Symmetry: C6
Subunit: 216 residues, 6 copies
Amino acid sequence: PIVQMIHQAISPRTLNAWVKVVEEKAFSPEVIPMFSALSEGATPQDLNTMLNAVGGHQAAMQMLKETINEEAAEWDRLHPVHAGPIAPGQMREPRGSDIAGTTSTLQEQIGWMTHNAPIPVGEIYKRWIILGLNKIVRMYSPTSILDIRQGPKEPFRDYVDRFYKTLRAEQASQEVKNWMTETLLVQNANPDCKTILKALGPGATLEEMMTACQGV
Amino acid sequence: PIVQMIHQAISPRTLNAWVKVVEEKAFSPEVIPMFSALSEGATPQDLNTMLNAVGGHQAAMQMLKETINEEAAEWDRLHPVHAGPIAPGQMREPRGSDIAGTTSTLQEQIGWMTHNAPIPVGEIYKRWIILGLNKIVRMYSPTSILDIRQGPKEPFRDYVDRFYKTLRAEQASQEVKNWMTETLLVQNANPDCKTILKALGPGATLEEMMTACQGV
Amino acid sequence: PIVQMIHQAISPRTLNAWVKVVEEKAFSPEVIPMFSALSEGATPQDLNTMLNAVGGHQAAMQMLKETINEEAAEWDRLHPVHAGPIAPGQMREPRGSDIAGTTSTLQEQIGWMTHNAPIPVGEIYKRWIILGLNKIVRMYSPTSILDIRQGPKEPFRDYVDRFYKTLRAEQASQEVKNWMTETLLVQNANPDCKTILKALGPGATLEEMMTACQGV
Amino acid sequence: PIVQMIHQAISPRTLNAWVKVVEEKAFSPEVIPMFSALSEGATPQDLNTMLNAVGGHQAAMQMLKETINEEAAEWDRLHPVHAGPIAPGQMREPRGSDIAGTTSTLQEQIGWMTHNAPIPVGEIYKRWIILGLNKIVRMYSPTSILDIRQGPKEPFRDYVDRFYKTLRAEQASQEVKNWMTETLLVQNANPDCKTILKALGPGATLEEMMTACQGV
Amino acid sequence: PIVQMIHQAISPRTLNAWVKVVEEKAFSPEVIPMFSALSEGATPQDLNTMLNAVGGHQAAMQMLKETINEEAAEWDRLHPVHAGPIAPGQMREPRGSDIAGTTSTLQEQIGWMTHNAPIPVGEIYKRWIILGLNKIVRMYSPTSILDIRQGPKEPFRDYVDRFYKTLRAEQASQEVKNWMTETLLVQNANPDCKTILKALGPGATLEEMMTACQGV
Amino acid sequence: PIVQMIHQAISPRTLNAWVKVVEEKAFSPEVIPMFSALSEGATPQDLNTMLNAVGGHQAAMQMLKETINEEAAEWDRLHPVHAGPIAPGQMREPRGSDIAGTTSTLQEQIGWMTHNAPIPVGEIYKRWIILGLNKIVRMYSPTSILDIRQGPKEPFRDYVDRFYKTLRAEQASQEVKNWMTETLLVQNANPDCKTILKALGPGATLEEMMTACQGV
Ligand SMILES: [Cl-]
Ligand SMILES: [Cl-]
Ligand SMILES: [Cl-]
Ligand SMILES: [Cl-]
Ligand SMILES: [Cl-]
Ligand SMILES: [Cl-]
Ligand SMILES: [Cl-]
Ligand SMILES: [Cl-]
Ligand SMILES: [Cl-]
Ligand SMILES: [Cl-]
Ligand SMILES: [Cl-]
Ligand SMILES: [Cl-]
Ligand SMILES: [Cl-]
Ligand SMILES: [Cl-]
Ligand SMILES: [Cl-]
Ligand SMILES: [Cl-]
Ligand SMILES: [Cl-]
Ligand SMILES: [Cl-]
Ligand SMILES: [Cl-]
Ligand SMILES: [Cl-]
Ligand SMILES: [Cl-]
Ligand SMILES: [Cl-]
Ligand SMILES: [Cl-]
Ligand SMILES: [Cl-]
Ligand SMILES: [Cl-]
Ligand SMILES: [Cl-]
Ligand SMILES: [Cl-]
Ligand SMILES: [Cl-]
Ligand SMILES: [Cl-]
Ligand SMILES: [Cl-]
Ligand SMILES: [Cl-]
Ligand SMILES: [Cl-]
Ligand SMILES: [Cl-]
Ligand SMILES: [Cl-]
Ligand SMILES: [Cl-]
Ligand SMILES: [Cl-]
């Protein structure tokens, strides 16, 4: 990565941490924040390093490759290369593959990131990667939000844990997720807690809901 | 984080330490100091990194989200955005969502924190987070302070351990906690140690109390 | 902490090291040096961080709180606040609670420590903490120095280990501890080694004593 | 290594990380990215350090030696040494063995890398090493891409994992690997999923294929 | 410690390393080099930190205290304090107890070490400590060099291992240790290897001796 | 060590790494590269630190001492000390024992290494140590290269592993090792693979040999 802006090689414990995360957590939602944290200020070479280090899950890594290629293609369509030689004191405009790090040197990436009025190639590539990771997380989620229902003997807190876990994996905008929270959560609770929740009303917070069904 | 003031990426072992703390300790009181220590000088992006890295406890993390949104809303009510373009050499006033890091870039956060006469967005957001964490710790505490009572064969020291643990989780100001210490502790001790404690008087320190019932 | 003088956030492995030390070693004497070593150059915020991170032993942590409050009160009596506004280029005199870090900001602590003709708030608070830790170590020691006696089949070296361990926990000045070393150690040895030790005389060193009873 | 450009000794945890990787992962594809990441900015002395540290797999390490010697020989043929004494302010042109680090000092390597209009000896040597590593990975792969076939009860995702693992080990250009992906993957699937995949058509993405046979 | 010269707090892993070394290795010879390595450039406060951190072996730590006091007393006899006030730009001459760190501040130690024409208080104290450690290692060694004898079925290499281990613990100058090597080693070997060793002669090296009795 | 050139104390994890390497790997060939890597830029004090830290293998450490003394003696014969006082701005020429670090201070070593037109005492001493380590590795190798022979059911790759391991331990120049590779390897293979190898010819590479007997 580059830290203020000075280039640093990716540390062994950062890379190991990411590898271990992929092994232990598969493609759980929390891996995406983790990834970002382990790739803070990272060059495209660092990001490719993290992805390539993963052994196994090669179907998911291939899907990630196809997503990255789609994003690179869209970038190329939006940003067409301009003919003519590069002038001194200037650098060539980055193609999609340069952002992915496959066709650009480390010095070129450093140059784009450090130069005044910069192009943050690492952050763009990072966005593409996180997009594909979201695709993978959503496909690999077994459960659907509609199916989560509270058991008759199940404590409300556990039910809310399951519900919001599944919700975190769901493919939906924040408006849709809001609708799910304010529609399905109370509807799918068990009858005792469901009645008690209905009694609270439409504006009840999560804290009030969990406190109300705490005894239940 | 930012260390003197120079921005640093959150270290892998800091993040791992926080994750492990959440796994092992759930929502015990000591997690809140720990959090602070692991977030010293942290940007809103770092704080969101720590929260988002948590897998599981999604009910608590959702409660935390609602608390953060309430605090952001109160901030927005107190600090209304002013119309007009931002001048050169100046930065826009931060909204509630910018303090939470959801709507502000890393460079904007760094700019607010580093600039002369700064706005410490990381510390404000950190306060909101710790507020919600206090809500969660208090709700997730099974015991109540009134119920802690010394067993007849129970050594006084163990009883004081239980008492002050439960007290640490309790929802009360320092005046109320003072009243609890000076009222309930001696009252709920077992009869031998309770008599001996009554003999000491109202001004007896904790050290004197534990020394007096040490043989008992 | 602050290292030369430049402020640094408390490292995750320092804090973890202290937590582990409290868990494994309880309140053995060696925890107090350890504490100091883990708090070298630490601000009051760092010290509070270390204390607050401890889970359990809440009776001892409460005793520590009462000791810190007594020391803060004595400081306040010795150093009375002076009326009048603080001038530019100067900082307010620290109250007891400011030294304990409960009522002072991190920037205020840094300012006191870094400024020319400084007030070392971290070292003062550290002294208070170590004082309370000594109270706790002494109360939590089960054994008394008078009771340590050499077994008939017990090797002298083991007996000296037990003796000086208990002595290290004892509540006594160096003059009293000297008297204990030169009175009780030889007196409480077993008859064979006790006779041999008496034969050496009053000025015999520990090395000579252990060498003399090595065969015994 | 050298980090910006300042020379650094190879860290103990980098070297240990590489050694552990060779032990645990043998010669799986992911070891080659790992190697690169652990050798970022490394001098030829660092690279030789990493290779020489490996215990066991001496057949593979010998193959690696022969590949490095072939690459050094080709370099020497392309770059013939020029007679005449080296001038002040200039350094001798590197031979193949100098790039491999066997015949060049650390100061010479540092000089080539740091000097203006530099020769990156570490990156050239690194390319040779990675070339030989590719030879070893390909020879040590037991499976062939043609043999990977989906089981009748085998979930499609597992089959795609096996397929792309074997493909990653395969000795083929990206055009050939493209042909394999678009020819053999759908052909070697089981009849239910194979029929469903045929129904999608030639332009179907991996995500669409896995989603389509997800129920299957 | 102080590293070039800039003061650094003792790291948590250095201290932990020393503690673990004392636990696992007791007072084996190799602990003394280890100690030195963990105390490189250390102030008297750091050295006291390392000694005080040790739990257990309190007889040995007390012996160490008596040795340090003897060395401090000899220093005081050689270096008598001179009456008169300390001038500006100058520092007081260190007493024995100041070198031991018991009566000197950290700033005083730093001042002695950093100042031009310095007094290396840390290295002097370190010498005293290592002297007492040698006393302890020698007393705690069970074996004597005269007793080490080769078994009839014992391989020569194992016998040389035992011999030089015991020799390393022995209390003797290098001239005496030379005499022991050139007298007792060949004399105490078993008859087959002893005869073969006698045949080599008085000037035979250790390598020649081990090679000669390798088959034996 | 010294890193660019600035002196650094040997890290705890470097030393621990070396100790663990000696414990686990004994005197396998790979320990010698490891040693070098852990001693990069190290002073003679650091090298002595690493050697002295080893517990056990005292026969080998003694052999190492005799080798170092022989190398120091040869250095002294080649470099005779010159009579006359050392001038200001100059340092005394190093004797053999100074290079070994037994008779030279840390400041003297630093001075030799840092000064313009330097004497690299650490690298010279390091060469002596590695020489003695080679003696030890060769003596402690049980197997001889002539004895390695392929089993009838033994896969060729395993046989090449054993062969080149033993070869790595062998006492021979690169010309002799070349002769062994091109004479004994094919000769000692089993008859099926030996016939197939003979069919390839004298110029066959290792890769071709292993590929040819892969089915065999
Ligand atoms: Cl690292
Ligand atoms: Cl994996
Ligand atoms: Cl999965
Ligand atoms: Cl790859
Ligand atoms: Cl953009
Ligand atoms: Cl519940
Ligand atoms: Cl880290
Ligand atoms: Cl968790
Ligand atoms: Cl919980
Ligand atoms: Cl997230
Ligand atoms: Cl504010
Ligand atoms: Cl008690
Ligand atoms: Cl750390
Ligand atoms: Cl604890
Ligand atoms: Cl306890
Ligand atoms: Cl707290
Ligand atoms: Cl004071
Ligand atoms: Cl004894
Ligand atoms: Cl390291
Ligand atoms: Cl290996
Ligand atoms: Cl393999
Ligand atoms: Cl080697
Ligand atoms: Cl090139
Ligand atoms: Cl599937
Ligand atoms: Cl550390
Ligand atoms: Cl111990
Ligand atoms: Cl012992
Ligand atoms: Cl102590
Ligand atoms: Cl001196
Ligand atoms: Cl032998
Ligand atoms: Cl370290
Ligand atoms: Cl060992
Ligand atoms: Cl061995
Ligand atoms: Cl030694
Ligand atoms: Cl030389
Ligand atoms: Cl084979």
